[model samples]
Target chain A: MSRLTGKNALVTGSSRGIGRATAVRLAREGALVAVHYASNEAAADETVAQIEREGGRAFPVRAELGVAGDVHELFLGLEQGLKERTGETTLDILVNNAAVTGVDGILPEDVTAEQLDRYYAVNAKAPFLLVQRAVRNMPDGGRIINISSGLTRCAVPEQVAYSMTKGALEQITLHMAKHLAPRGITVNSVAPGIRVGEAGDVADVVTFIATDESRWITGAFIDASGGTLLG
Target chain B: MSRLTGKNALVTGSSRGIGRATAVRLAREGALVAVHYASNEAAADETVAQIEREGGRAFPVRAELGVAGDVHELFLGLEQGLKERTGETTLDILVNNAAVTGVDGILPEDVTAEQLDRYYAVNAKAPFLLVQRAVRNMPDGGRIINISSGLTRCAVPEQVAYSMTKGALEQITLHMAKHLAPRGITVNSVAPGITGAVFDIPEIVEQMAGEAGDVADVVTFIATDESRWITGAFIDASGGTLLG
Candidate 1:
């Protein structure tokens, strides 16, 4: 039996990049995945096809988050997809992976109100709302993972506003873990340092934390930044 | 002239604890020290007496923090004390070292809302507000070191609320560092683990004394200028506890 044989997962922005790889990986481990995308239906379909071809279960769901009414509609579509695919109305895992970056640096002068609103809306606000929705549908022993960035700790120049959103996300993870511990739900934020193209070794660290071995760990922020912050 | 020469440094809760040690250490380096206390006036005065007997400047300031308006009043008294003594209103360094631990080893259900609120008010809210007041009296290039705990990183059973407050304080340190960086000021947190009377060191000291390594020396290094470039970083200062 697979480690995730009975698990159901929803990975946002799974059409490409880290999200795609995470979806494929989780499916390979026996998770029935809902590969979600904000746009580009073809990319989402391609991810689902790859999973299916590899003898794993996956379906595509679409929702344009970071906009008005998108979060509500996204869950509605997710509920439908979950029912159609697995005959279940609840999800066991939620990976909030989608985020927007500020065009300019996070300096007071360079970061505009519009840019701040967009970055916070997409990066911070959306993940929070998604987690709120996921917690309602999650059963005991559920997992909520937020993909944050290493810039928050490293203080990367010009990435201040972007990093601020992730910092808030980290704080949110801590509070949510405390709030949900009674229900046996764990919430954590995985901070990746500079993954140029692929998810690389960080994925393994995240996978370990998501497994049963890490049930004791919650409200933790794992620094998968390849020792960037350590040095 | 030393950076701290002729300047006043106030460290709260400095009475035979981490605060006392830091107080004397800062005085030895040049700053005139004010040993602040909540109770133990004798211990506080003893700290001051030690500094003065050594030909260093020292005094005591007493206030009960965790009470509304007490922290503000303490700093206001500090301002007056500094002016009366040195004819200066600016302080060179401000170390917010006072803290309280909430209910231990209890699950969220067992912990009360009063316990949680009091912990936040004292640990999380107090540090930020203290920094706000301290910054107004601190000159450019001043240093603000908030003493945090190592439990912020390590997950120990029953320390959830305490660790949460420190976690928030660490984030506050990062934000304040960015906010004050342009002013040539630096804000950092020193997280000490299981130090002072909490843990017996004789065993570990004997273990490492005759060996080729000295663990205590590593902690001393963090408190020196050798680590000047490492701002907004939580120096473990917890020996090998976190590493273990």
Candidate 2:
């Protein structure tokens, strides 16, 4: 039952939605998880509680992204937490799952510089920084999984800004795959199309990519939207 | 020289790169081009000039994207340009070539707020915006060519974010192909691997390498009446990078 036994994982933005689900799924697969949340302490606690209840190891860590120096503090905290629990300094998995969809539905004139900056800060920049930090602490043969959206594939009128952020993330996926190949780290992104909860059709595909079954898959974005893109 | 003669086409981001090249290529083949660029009047004018110098007809138009207000502006510009140049606004081809790479590099700590936002704004948001605008200007029996990257097929480090956007773009291409089936606007993506420009491969050598030939065959098939039934599909132009 343990596909990732003895592996330690960190899932950011694990307080809700895809991040939370991914944390739980990784735990079920035998990865000792560091459940991360930005502001939702209760949600992080609950995620860890659920994992522990299921005989999986998990702990909560708070990292307020987009704020000055929060990401560093968060990773440092995660390192300490891992050391206390598993006595390990190197992580096996790092999931760049934290993201924010900034200010939707604003017309061109209405789009403030503040909103645009906020969107870029949390969604695009945070992931890159997380990767930089995580790779340094990861051992050879590590895995870095990015959770991206399906909106970038299909045009959604109101979500243009959000989608662009995701696109930039994908570009990073490609470059990093080549950059990090020699280090024995496999980098990949899992983009789910318009699925909201755990019971969706996309879950199976996401789970498959995260497992050993998809080892050959790197720098690849598997569509998990039940062909919603066939629109 | 007349690969697209008697053909009508629309190219998004026709101001540069693969989009500009494809535009010129189609024009050389005898197609009249509705050259669309989001900004840069001079670059678009240059594209038109190159096409015209080659004995091809091209008209330039400007459209500001990532804004709802700009959608109508884009189509209006296309219509005006088409009417003046070709006496028709009905398009036989639509190339969704405009995309933004929001950001590059990896490392959770290294990525900044501005970098991430920029990545999505151009890559994910703009493509959808372009598609929505392009669909309105397209006619039946038309071609919807979405430009995707080979990275989507192969996972590489530091490209997780950019690849994800294309992944989303490909999914959209598949869905729209099926959705627009009745309308006959065939949707497909041309996902080229690290091409000459990015990889420093010489044009003659690359052409001799048979990469362009293989891609041209796929593109010709997709744009022709032969590929009429090939909807909701992605034809890999990757040079054996993703093969198992």
Candidate 3:
């Protein structure tokens, strides 16, 4: 039996990038995963098909975060899928991996309030709101992992707005860890370097975090940055 | 001559507490300081009066952060004050010291989206937008200091939203440190601990012995050229409360 043989998980933005890799890994561990995406139905379908091909259970859920009723829409699909598959709405693991990496030459001097708010809404606010709802149906001793960027710790002037949102995400980890500790739920942030390492390598760490062996670590920031932060 | 002689500086939330101390310190060092306040005009007037009593130059600028067109309104007052004082609108130093400390019994599990948005808008977004405008009016070798909290490095689940805003503020320090380095500008974060009514914990207060003046003095130092080499640094002015 796999470590998560009976668990159900959701990996937001699993249509591509690190989100896809983490969704695949979690499903491979015998957990049924809801591979989430914003608008890329094909990519999400591809992820679900790949998981199924690998003899794992998976499905695709779509919700474009940063808009009105996004969390409700997301959980609408998520709860329905979980109920259909497992006969319950309990979520065992949640990986907030979606983000808007603003790299279109939008400098701090030129970035408008609309642009900044959109980034915060998508990256930081969406995760916080998601956790708020997820915990209601989450059983005791579950996992909440936030896929943050190393930019939160270091400086990437070009992506200042994005880095700031990740900074907020990490704080969510710190605060949620304490809030959910009494119920045995663990919340941790994984800061993979901004594309410095392969998606699979980071996925492995996310898988470990979702496992029972890493239960001792909570409110911790795990550096999956491949030593890019070493100075 | 004082360290910041003839320099133009702005300290947000300078009407009271650490912000007031920093504004006073900057003015005392010969910088014509703009004492910014969101509300509380009387307190801002008092700050300016105190600076004048000490033979320092100062003025009041009012613009509540987190509101629409906040940055524009702030700079409108800031620019007019600077031009009136120095014949030019060059801002030499910017101290982002204003923040919305959400300790209204809102926990992480129960924090509303509106509450979270307000905190980020005031603490993080306000500072970022302020810097965006400040840089255009600023000359080379300028200084931008973010007044962060020790709660950013540590944890207090009660003030989760507030801490998250400070975390975003710190990242702004990191990114601005590099982006502004080429222009000879230096950016840094000053994390202070248990200064006033913000943290009512007795044990931590017993552990925190540093005064608000101590933190302001550090900010004043960074406003000068002597600390030019120190950018993107999280100056732990928590007075050993965060030794770990």
RMSD of 1: 17.6
Give the clash count for each candidate.
0, 75, 0
Compute the lDDT for candidate 1: 0.70
- Model 2 bad stretches (over 4 Å): A102-104, A195-203, B1-244
Cα lDDT of model 2 by residue, B61-149, tens digit: 78766555766787787788778767877778877766554233465466666655655665667767767767676777788887777
Model 3, residue B29: C-alpha shift (Å) = 0.5
Residue A176, candidate 1: C-alpha displacement in angstroms = 0.4
Summarize candidate 2's per-residue lDDT along A49-75 as a digit string, tens digits: 888989999999887888899778888
Chain B TM, every candidate? 0.83, 0.81, 0.93
Query: Per-candidate TM vs. native?
Result: 0.51, 0.51, 0.50
What is the fnat value (0 to 1) for candidate 3?
Answer: 0.00
Name the better of 2 and 3 by TM-score.
Answer: 2
The CAPRI quality class of candidate 2 comes to incorrect
What TM-score does chain A reach in every model? 0.93, 0.92, 0.97
Ranking by lDDT: 3, 1, 2
Cα lDDT tens digits for candidate 3, B1-244: 2879989999998887778889999998899999999888998999999999999999999998999999999999998888877799999999998777754446578988998899999999999999999999888889999988888767667777888888899999888877886787878887776432345222233234246676687687668774554577666555434433
Between candidates 1 and 2, the one scoring higher on DockQ is 2
